């Protein structure tokens, strides 16, 4: 809507960049966090338009983070990444302001695609014509 940002929680530093550059690649704005509490700060400070929390991150989860982010916005469009089939803390994290979840085993194109279908801004999704 206004400042359509995407926050990306990663410790590896590369994963965050992967989504940072690919979200931006599409025409987005992104940011990164090495725990969750960081994106947390950036949500209460910047209020992105969408956030991602890799609970697969090297150490911690941004679960109580989205928790506080849903205390801060209730649903700042969070997406928590898991081991594709882990989702151990997923239930609370998803009811906690997250619009959905993802996987650390995610696909790049799937990541930009999935977020455009949820938090849209310029990346159009075809569900109005039904033709593609």
Swiss-Prot record:
Its main location: cytoplasm. InterPro entries: Bact_response_regulator, CheY-like_superfamily, Sig_transdc_resp-reg_receiver. Its EC number is 2.7.-.-. Disulfide bonds: none annotated. It is an enzyme of class 2 (transferase). It comes from the Bacteria. GO terms for biological process: phosphorelay signal transduction system; sporulation resulting in formation of a cellular spore. GO terms for molecular function: kinase activity; metal ion binding. Binds 1 Mg(2+) ion per subunit. Phosphorylated by KinA and KinB. Dephosphorylated by RapA and RapB. It is found in: Cytoplasm. Keywords: Cytoplasm, Kinase, Magnesium, Metal-binding, Phosphoprotein, Sporulation, Transferase, Two-component regulatory system. Transmembrane segments: none annotated. Its cofactor is Mg(2+). The modification 4-aspartylphosphate is found at residue 54. Mg(2+) binds at residues 10-11, 54, 56. GO terms for cellular component: cytoplasm. Residues 5-119 form the Response regulatory domain. Key element in the phosphorelay regulating sporulation initiation. Phosphorylation of spo0B during sporulation initiation. This is Sporulation initiation phosphotransferase F. It comes from Bacillus subtilis (strain 168).
């Amino acid at each position: 809507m206004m400042n359509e940002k995407i926050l990306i929680v990663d410790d590896q530093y590369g994963i965050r960049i992967l989504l940072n550059e690919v979200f931006n690649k599409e025409g987005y704005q992104t940011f990164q966090a090495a725990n969750g509490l960081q994106a947390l700060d950036i949500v209460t400070k910047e209020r992105p338009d969408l956030v991602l929390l890799d609970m697969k991150i090297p150490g911690m989860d941004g679960i109580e983070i989205a928790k506080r982010m849903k205390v801060i916005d209730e649903n700042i469009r969070v997406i928590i990444m898991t081991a594709y089939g882990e989702l151990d803390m997923i239930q609370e994290s998803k009811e906690l302001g997250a619009l959905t979840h993802f996987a650390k085993p995610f696909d790049i194109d799937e990541i930009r695609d999935a977020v455009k279908k949820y938090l849209p801004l310029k990346s159009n999704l075809e569900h109005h014509h039904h033709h593609h």
